Amino acid sequence: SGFRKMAFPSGKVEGCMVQVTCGTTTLNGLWLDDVVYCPRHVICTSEDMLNPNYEDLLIRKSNHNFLVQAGNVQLRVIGHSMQNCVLKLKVDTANPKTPKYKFVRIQPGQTFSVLACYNGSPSGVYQCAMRPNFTIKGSFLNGSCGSVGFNIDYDCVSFCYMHHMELPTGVHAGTDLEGNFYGPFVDRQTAQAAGTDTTITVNVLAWLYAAVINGDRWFLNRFTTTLNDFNLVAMKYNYEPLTQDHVDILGPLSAQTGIAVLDMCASLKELLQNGMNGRTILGSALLEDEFTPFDVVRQCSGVT
Amino acid sequence: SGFRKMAFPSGKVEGCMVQVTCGTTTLNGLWLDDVVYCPRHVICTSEDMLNPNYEDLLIRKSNHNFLVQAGNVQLRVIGHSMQNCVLKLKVDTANPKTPKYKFVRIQPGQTFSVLACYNGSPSGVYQCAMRPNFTIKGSFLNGSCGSVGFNIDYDCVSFCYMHHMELPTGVHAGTDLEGNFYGPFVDRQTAQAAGTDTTITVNVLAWLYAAVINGDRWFLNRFTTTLNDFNLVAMKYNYEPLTQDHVDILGPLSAQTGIAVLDMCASLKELLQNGMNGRTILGSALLEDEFTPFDVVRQCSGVT
Ligand SMILES: O=C1C[C@@](O)(C(=O)Nc2cncc3ccccc23)c2cc(Cl)ccc2N1
Ligand SMILES: O=C1C[C@@](O)(C(=O)Nc2cncc3ccccc23)c2cc(Cl)ccc2N1
């Protein structure tokens, strides 16, 4: 028992991290097969970042201007291309530590592990969620650019996120591995509005099921609700509306605990209207929305 | 910016995890050089665990009864010995993935990363603290035994914890890598009292400094205090007494923020006496004690 914000083991991703330098800018790159992926802002100077013309800036660059270092050995760049907001540097050596992998674009509300890196070196691993507004509440400093987000299914690493920037608000923005930003964000040093964020309702319900599985049951009540009634409350508290799709994904947890989804919704409704009254759930004094129903079942069943 | 409960990258430890079977019991082992370390309860049956005579039980076992599997290849056991609560299985092959390592016994209040494993396979990584009462609030299911806790300093892995058991209270207990339990715990299926736990005061102060570094400053007040006055409050709220040693370790954070340690103590005193009033600090509605002053500086400076 016990419930922790658990990240995937980072080993398969650590073997892919490289350092990419172009001019005076150094950031992280992801080496898979004979290709290194990194943010396209690696080609910028400080004056360029205010309004960069990436096409023009990349033209002034040659393969030899991209210094790729894997650990302490240098990689030879034989090709360069821009795909949306990432650069793909073709190297002459295939990474011998390339795991089985996929590039996937995650949906908001889904979770992933981030391997924070500096100078191509892994420094830490943490679990986070893609916010409904397409930002991530990470932990990233200057040089962290190029760090990736991923999920692991047995031996396959699904890369879903590459870190690009920190908005003036302190939240983080980035792309999938094809260079498409999640959200309305652009890779420019400009004020950018992230939308109104909401709480991931299905995840909070999954975490309430994890609390029940782990003995924390004080919040359970003698009430039930309807999807429509619950959603009136969810709207008032900036929670994502619950759909039958969310109810269906909560099926396994509803079966394991024997608590119908709408009964757990009623518990959540009372928690939202009345607060925690100074109590905690799984060691937290607020409602946690960074565990999906899949995460809760995985952790509560020990999937390796 | 941003502050996350970050674990160390688990790659160096994943390369050491093996599966150890003895009779019908399977748990995790740690393969370093030509030695596999695992909990000595691997030699027990269910009836044995109530009051095991480990010396007698181990006598009935031979090298060939210990099945050690690294990934999918079998290791040949050429020696077996019990050291306190761990078994050391000498194998004829040195682990080619053995990182530079040390066995260290951590002090209560210190933190470490856990690589949760099942059947010798890593399933997740999370950061936790050794509670002042020598328990850990982990996330462990049956089969997790043998999972280890560690810290990483550049290329050196300091192993500090091996998981042994879950107490009836849901908290976790285990040993250092020499088999010495942290706390009064014994490896028996018996009711065991963990002492009264306290909050790691120096860690909460470090986390308050991390909040200040990250912009969350609402809790800062126009007050100061003395070590003696603050400790009267710490005693009342089950917080560890603050010593000049803790003040000295907070030095770097006091210098970075320009907030004297006793001024931060006064902020903490008001937070303890008056609560959070429905506000949050670094996304948390309670006072976090699982980040040491070293963790805060490391994360806030990006040490790889
Ligand atoms: O300040 C910058 C540099 C930049 O490379 C960046 O934000 N990176 C970092 C990434 N993540 C977190 C950070 C925290 C502290 C400083 C830097 C961070 C950058 C890139 C873009 Cl596409 C737009 C604006 C900027 N503005
Ligand atoms: O139930 C048991 C089996 C035992 O191997 C154990 O607790 N392991 C597990 C370890 N960690 C978490 C768990 C959670 C759920 C079940 C098992 C857990 C065990 C070992 C000892 Cl030295 C004493 C009592 C016991 N009692």
- B271 touches A at CB < 8 Å: no
- Alpha carbon distance B47, B24 (integer Å): 13
Contact present, B58 and B42 (Cβ < 8 Å):
no
Rounded to the nearest angstrom, the distance between the alpha carbon of A142 and the centre of ligand 1 is 6
Closest residue on chain B to A151 (Cα): B124
Q: Nearest-5° angle of CA A159, CA A163, CA A165?
A: 160
Which residues, other chains included, contact A253 with Cβ-Cβ below 8 Å and sequence gap of 6+? A206, A209, A210, A213, A293, A296, A297
Closest by Cα among B116, B298, B24, B68 to A3? B116
**Environment class of B7 (CB within 10 Å of its CB; exposed 0-12, middle 13-18, buried 19+):** buried
* CB-CB under 8 Å, A7 with B11: no
Q: Of the candidates A221, A282, A168, which has an alpha carbon nearest to the alpha carbon of residue B285? A: A282
Cβ-in-10-Å burial (0-12, 13-18, 19+) of B83 comes to: middle
- A83/B contact by beta carbon, under 8 A: no
Residue of B nearest to A138 (CA): B2
Elucidation method: X-ray
What residue type is assigned to position B106 of the chain? I
A189-201 CB burial, b ≥16 within 10 A, e <16? beebebeeebbbb
Strand partners, A67: A21
Count the Cβ atoms, other than its own, within 10 Å of residue A110.
17
* A81 closest CA partner among A40, A31, A49: A40
Does the CB of A207 have a partner CB in chain B at under 8 Å?
no
- Give the H/E segment covering residue A212: helix A201-213
The domain segmentation of chain A, as residue ranges, is 1-14+100-197, 15-99, 198-301
- Given resolution (angstroms): 1.9
Q: How many CB atoms sit inside 10 A of residue B285's CB?
A: 18
- Interface with A, mutate which of B3, B4, B287 (most A CBs under 10 A): B4
Active-site residue list of B: 41, 145
Amino acid (one-letter) located at B183: G
Domain B1-14+100-197 has CATH 3.40.50.300: no
Report residues whose beta carbon is within 6 angstroms of any ligand 1 atom.
A 41, 49, 140-142, 144-145, 163-166, 187-189; B 1
What is the separation, in whole angstroms, between the first and last Cα of chain A?
16
* Cα–chain center distance at B56: 31
Amino acid at B200: I
| Cα–Cα dist B222/A178, whole Å | 51
- CA A133 → CA A109, A130, A240, distances in Å? 9, 8, 11
Structure letter (DSSP) for residue A110: -
CATH code at B15-99: 2.40.10.10
In angstroms, rounded to a whole number, what is the distance separating the alpha carbons of residues A161 and A164? 9
Angle between helices B293-301 and B201-213 in degrees, nearest 10? 20
CA distance B299 to A146: 17
Question: H or E element: which one contains A296?
Answer: helix A293-301
* Distance (Å, whole) CA B298 – CA B292: 10
B26: which 2 tokens? Answer: 């399977």
Q: Which residue has the tokens 């992933």?
A: A112
Chain centroid to Cα A60, Å, comes to: 33
CA A10-A15-A21 angle, to 5 degrees, is: 115
Please count the other Cβ atoms lying within 10 Å of the Cβ belonging to residue B213: 19
Q: How far is residue A288's CA from residue A156's CA, in Å, rounded to a whole number?
A: 28
**How far is B264 from B213, CA to CA, in rounded Å?**
13
- For residue B210, give the chain A residue with the closest CA: A139
Q: From ligand 2's centre to the CA of B140, what distance in Å? A: 9
Nearest to A147 by CA among A300, A29, A230, A263: A29
- Atom number, ligand 2, closest to the C-alpha of residue B39: 22
Q: Half-sphere exposure of residue B282, counting CA atoms within 13 Å on the CB side?
A: 24
The residues that bridge with A136 in the sheet, in sequence order, are A172
> Which chain A positions have a beta carbon within 8 Å of B300's beta carbon?
141
> Would you call B294 an interface residue with chain A, using a CB distance cutoff of 8 Å?
no
Structure-block tokens of residue A232: 């009136």
What share of residues in chain A are helix, strand, coil (percent, to 5)? 25, 30, 45
Name the residue facing B123 among A172, A215, A302 (closest C-beta): A302
In this structure, what token pair is assigned to residue B48? 């044995």
B154 Cβ neighbours under 8 A, 6+ residues apart: none
Angle, helices A293-301 vs A201-213, to 10°: value is 20
Q: Look at B123 and A304 and tell me if their CB atoms are within 8 Å.
A: yes
CATH topology for A198-301 is main proteinase (3clpro) structure, domain 3 (1.10.1840)
Pairing, β B156-166 against β B100-103: parallel
Identical fold, A1-14+100-197 and A15-99: yes
User: With an 8 Å Cβ cutoff, are A303 and B123 in contact?
Assistant: yes
Query: Which residue minimizes the CA distance to atom 6 of ligand 2?
Result: B165
Ligand 2 centroid vs A208 CA: distance in angstroms? 24
A19, with CB counted inside 10 A (0-12, 13-18, 19+), is buried
Spell out the residues 6+ positions from residue B56 whose beta carbon is closer than 8 angstroms to its own.
none
Q: Which of B122, B136, B116, B137 is nearest to B15 (CA)?
A: B122
Q: Which of B302, B19, B113 is nearest to A10 (CA)?
A: B113
* Contact between chains at B304 and A121 (C-beta distance less than 8 A): yes
